[PDB]
Amino acid sequence: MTDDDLRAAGVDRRVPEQKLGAAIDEFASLRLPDRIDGRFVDGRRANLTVFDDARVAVRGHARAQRNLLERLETELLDPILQGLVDVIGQGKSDIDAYATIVEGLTKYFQSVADVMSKLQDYISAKDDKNMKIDGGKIKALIQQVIDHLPTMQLPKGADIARWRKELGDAVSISDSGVVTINPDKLIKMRDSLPPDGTVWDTARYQAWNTAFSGQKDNIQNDVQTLVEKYSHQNSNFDNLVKVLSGAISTLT
Numbered sequence: 001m002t003d004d005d006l007r008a009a010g011v012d013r014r015v016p017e018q019k020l021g022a023a024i025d026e027f028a029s030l031r032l033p034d035r036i037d038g039r040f041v042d043g044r045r046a047n048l049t050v051f052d053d054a055r056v057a058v059r060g061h062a063r064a065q066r067n068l069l070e071r072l073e074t075e076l077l078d079p080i081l082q083g084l085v086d087v088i089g090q091g092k093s094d095i096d097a098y099a100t101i102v103e104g105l106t107k108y109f110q111s112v113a114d115v116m117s118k119l120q121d122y123i124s125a126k127d128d129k130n131m132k133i134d135g136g137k138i139k140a141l142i143q144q145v146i147d148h149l150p151t152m153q154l155p156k157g158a159d160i161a162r163w164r165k166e167l168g169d170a171v172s173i174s175d176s177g178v179v180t181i182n183p184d185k186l187i188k189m190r191d192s193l194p195p196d197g198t199v200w201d202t203a204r205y206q207a208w209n210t211a212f213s214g215q216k217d218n219i220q221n222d223v224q225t226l227v228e229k230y231s232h233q234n235s236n237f238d239n240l241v242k243v244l245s246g247a248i249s250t251l252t
Contacts (some may be wrong), residue, residue, distance in 0.1 A: 001245035006238055007216075010064045013234035016057035020106070020227050023054040027109060027220055028114040032209050033123045033131075035202055040125030045117035051110035055103050058230075062099035065237055066092065072241065076248050084244055091240045096155045098233045101167065101225070103180060104152040108181050109223050111145045114217065131205040135193030142190040151166035152179040166229070185215045 006012070026046050033043040073088050118141060122134035154163060154177035164173050172180045192212055194200070198206070 001242045003238070005245075006068075006241060007106060009068050011061070011068050011241070012064075013061065013231070013237070013238065014063040016054070017227075017231050019054040019057040020102075020230070021111065023051045023106065024220065024224060024227065026050040027113050029224075030113060030216070032213060033120055033125075033130065034206070034209065035131070037123070038129045043120045043123075045120065046113040047075055048110060048114065049141055051106055051113065055106045055129050058099055058102050058106065062095055065095045068241060069095070069108075072244055072248065073111050074246065076251070080247065080251070084247060087240065091237065093155045093235065094233055098157065098161070098230050100152050100154070101171075104179070105181070105226055106152040107150045107170070109219070111148070112186070112216070112219055115141045126199050129202055130199055131202070132192060132197075132199045133205070134196045135198055136196035139190055139193045142186055142193075144219070146183050146226065148188070149181050149183065153177055154179060168222075168225060170226065171215075185219050189215045193243075 023133075024083065029044055030046050031044045034041050057067045069088060069091055076084060090252070115138070122137045124132050126132040152158070154173070156177075158177055160173050160175060160177060163179070167173070170180060170182055174180070189212055192208060194208075
């Protein structure tokens with residue numbers, strides 16, 4: 001089976017991967033209000049639909065993979081036969097797992113992008129060179145994002161141990177197979193805000209902006225890493241499909 005054979009079969013990994021990249025790019029472009037030469041410079045909000053598109057592509061791709069895997073299996077139904085079946089089962093578990101994990105991480109990514117944009121309504125210029133920040137109102141919004149974080153359930157019978165090493169630090173896994181998003185960075189961000197009505201001079205605000213934006217950047221690295229892992233799974237799937245597709249031709 002060739003790369004184009006895969007595509008004709010409806011499986012094109014470039015699609016979801018490009019979309020996830022576009023969402024990461026949308027995230028990176030987000031920028032808090034600042035002052036350049038005493039001139040208050042508005043920030044950049046985010047297009048939230050970019051994240052919705054990523055999520056639909058991830059779900060779409062998963063369905064396409066399951067379709068192929070299933071038709072490949074049905075037409076392959078001995079040692080070789082048993083081994084291939086045990087591999088097909090593993091392949092399916094990984095398809096459902098990553099799709100689930102990636103969709104949840106995307107919702108999380110989308111929500112942070114939301115506070116990043118909304119929060120800008122509470123940051124304005126006061127004096128000729130002073131910044132007014134309503135930390136309380138922003139703090140409340142970050143707390144909301146924390147409260148409603150998405151939760152992802154792994155497929156039945158999944159090596160919780162292996163997935164823990166796989167997913168990394170940004171995430172955690174329950175013995176019940178529930179993968180959660182670490183609120184570590186959102187907490188640091190929330191704990192950095194000042195009370196409402198706070199007015200900071202340029203230097204002071206820039207200090208906070210640097211730290212805050214630093215955490216935002218950390219969230220982006222987490223997602224980016226996970227995305228790279230997801231895309232590596234898509235590659236592993238294409239290989240599985242190619243091998244068992246050859247086995248089918250060999251056994252015929």
